[PDB]
């Protein structure tokens, strides 16, 4: 059985194998909403009665986060001061076909959860929410004038 603490036989709210945790990735500017989620995750991860149970993490509403970041009316630095001096990890992959701001925001949001777990059970984070258009857009960007 799998417990669903977020908001095989899966039941919400000793026969426990894994935990599925769901949070909204675009709630960084609501009065915060990521702070409560991170506090809850830190509370559930350090429990002594769950020292052998793994956690699967779902991060949905990614497109809304991308739109909010691209709009520019709201900035993460006004809510998370440490974001100003953040540097990308060593396992990051550059994406020339995307705006760097959304990539940095995604990596920062993942690392916020990952550092709690890294600092025996494990954690698995998953982001949740066309090949023709990807190639066509690439051709238009790499064209060089003679």
């Amino acid at each position: 059985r799998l417990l669903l603490l977020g908001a095989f036989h899966m039941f919400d709210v000793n026969d426990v194998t894994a935990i599925i945790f769901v949070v909204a990735s675009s709630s960084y500017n609501m009065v915060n909403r990521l702070q409560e989620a991170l506090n809850l995750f830190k509370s559930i991860w350090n429990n002594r009665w769950l020292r052998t149970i793994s956690v699967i993490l779902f991060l949905n509403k990614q497109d809304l986060l991308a739109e909010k970041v691209l709009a520019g009316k709201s900035k993460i630095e006004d809510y998370f001061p440490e974001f100003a001096r953040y540097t990308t990890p060593e396992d990051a992959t550059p994406e020339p076909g995307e705006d760097p701001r959304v990539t940095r925001a995604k990596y920062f949001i993942r690392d916020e959860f990952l550092r709690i777990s890294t600092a025996r059970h494990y954690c698995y984070p998953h982001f949740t929410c066309d090949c023709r258009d990807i190639i066509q857009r690439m051709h238009l960007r790499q064209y060089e004038l003679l």
């Binding site: 095989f8 494990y122 090949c131 066509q136």
Partner: protein, 458 residues
């Protein structure tokens, strides 16, 4: 610009050549312009077209076209020079009206005119409408036909194909005429076959010499341009298919299979050629993709192209940049090939997922292909992780238990959540009857294996 125009208005043909050669040498590598001298550039550009009307030696024409190509890099000065007469002059100079190639001294003029046309068409949008009204694609195809087999006409072919690629990328009606009313597929396929020098042994088989010399940069450039144009030609209509086109779609796949088994002059050119070949292969209907295998062997067949594709995918996985535009096409192609044909799936299963012998370490810790593909399943990009999970799902005959045996429930949660199989089960397509394939060590260990992590834990 002031000295130039002063002499340009003068008749004499030596001074103009020297002035324009000096101007070309000075500004040969400039791509940024200032707004202080816009009018002085516009006046010179207007004078250049006025000069080209009269009859002048070839040396002056080449210099004028070079200066015009240098000046065409700026969009702000292309407003008052995009009329019909200028485009007609450019087409006349490129022999698109005058369609004779009996003189060898006029080739650089044609090349320069094609370059100027490419620049002007890309920068200006009125030029696209004028090209549509002037029937440019038909004349380009006529020139391509007239260039069937001769000598010293490689650059003309490359820049003709480049102009065709630009026109088909920017405008849709021209794409429709090229696909349907102009018969571009056989012409481009013949161009590719002439580039590769393909000799047929059977209806859809070609002779391969493993000790043959590599290609040349000229042929590599021609092939790259032809593949890039063919991608745009066949992208408009692929969801509708009828039996009348199967022969033409199979010849193309045979040519591409020949392409996947050769090498270029350097490694970068080879990678570019193979990437463009994969991009074109991604458009062909799947029911015509069975000519990739001939009667590395599996069940009395030849399975080398799949090995080449697997090595390409692994080498692109090894580097850690541009996963969205460097991994999705080949993974999608492999998945679609495996889903429809049996021999390809059975050959890939025992190469990517050999029978399990070691359960001491975690699936994502290691340096094999399986470890890399499992590590790719938790990326921050959606398409990459989805296609990476779907490939391994297809290779396991769409059964949940066989997937959890090799990757673990933790790494496979995304696909199970997306497809609704989050509580077990199987897919919809049926492949064949289950068989036993278990190693002896795993049978002893199996009772002490964690489902979520998928390894034997001490």
């Amino acid at each position: 610009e002031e000295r130039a125009l002063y002499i340009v208005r003068a008749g004499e043909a030596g001074a103009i050549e020297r002035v324009l050669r000096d101007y070309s040498d000075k500004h040969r590598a400039t791509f940024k312009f200032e707004s202080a001298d816009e009018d002085k550039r516009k006046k010179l550009c207007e004078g250049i077209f006025k000069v080209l009307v009269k009859e002048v030696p070839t040396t002056c024409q080449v210099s004028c076209l070079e200066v015009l190509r240098i000046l065409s890099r700026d969009k702000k000065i292309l407003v008052p020079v995009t009329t019909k007469e200028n485009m007609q002059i450019l087409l006349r100079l490129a022999k698109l009206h005058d369609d004779s190639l009996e003189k060898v001294s006029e080739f650089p003029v044609i090349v320069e005119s094609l370059k100027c046309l490419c620049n002007i068409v890309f920068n200006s949008q009125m030029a696209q409408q004028l090209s549509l009204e002037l029937n440019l694609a038909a004349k380009l195809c006529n020139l391509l036909r007239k260039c069937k087999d001769r000598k010293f006409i490689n650059d003309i072919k490359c820049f003709d194909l480049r102009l065709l690629f630009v026109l088909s990328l920017l405008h849709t009606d021209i794409r429709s005429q090229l696909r349907y009313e102009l018969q571009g597929l056989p012409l481009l396929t013949q161009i590719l076959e002439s580039a590769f020098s393909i000799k047929w042994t059977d209806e859809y088989e070609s002779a391969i010499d493993h000790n043959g010399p590599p290609l040349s940069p000229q042929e590599t450039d021609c092939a790259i341009e032809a593949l890039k144009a063919l991608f745009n030609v066949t992208v408009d209509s692929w969801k509708v298919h009828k039996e009348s086109d199967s022969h033409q779609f199979r010849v193309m796949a045979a040519v591409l299979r020949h392409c996947l088994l050769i090498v270029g002059p350097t490694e970068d050119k080879t990678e570019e050629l193979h990437s463009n070949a994969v991009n074109l292969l991604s458009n062909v209907p799947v029911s015509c993709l069975d000519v990739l295998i001939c009667p590395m062997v599996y069940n009395g067949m030849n399975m080398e192209a799949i090995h080449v594709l697997l090595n390409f995918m692994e080498k692109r996985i090894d580097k850690g940049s541009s996963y969205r535009e460097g991994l999705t096409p080949v993974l999608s192609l492999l998945t679609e090939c495996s889903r429809a044909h049996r021999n390809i799936r059975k050959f890939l299963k025992d190469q990517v997922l050999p029978p399990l012998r070691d359960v001491t370490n975690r699936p994502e810790v290691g340096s094999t292909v399986r470890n890399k593909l499992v590590r790719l399943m938790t990326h921050v990009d959606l398409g990459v992780k989805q296609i990476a999970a779907e490939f391994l799902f297809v290779l396991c005959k769409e059964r949940v238990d066989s997937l959890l045996k090799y990757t673990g429930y933790g790494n496979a949660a995304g696909l199970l959540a997306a497809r609704g199989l989050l509580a077990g089960g199987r897919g919809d397509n049926w492949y064949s009857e289950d068989e036993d394939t278990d190693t002896e060590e795993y049978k002893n260990a199996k009772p002490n294996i964690n489902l979520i992590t998928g390894h034997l834990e001490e």
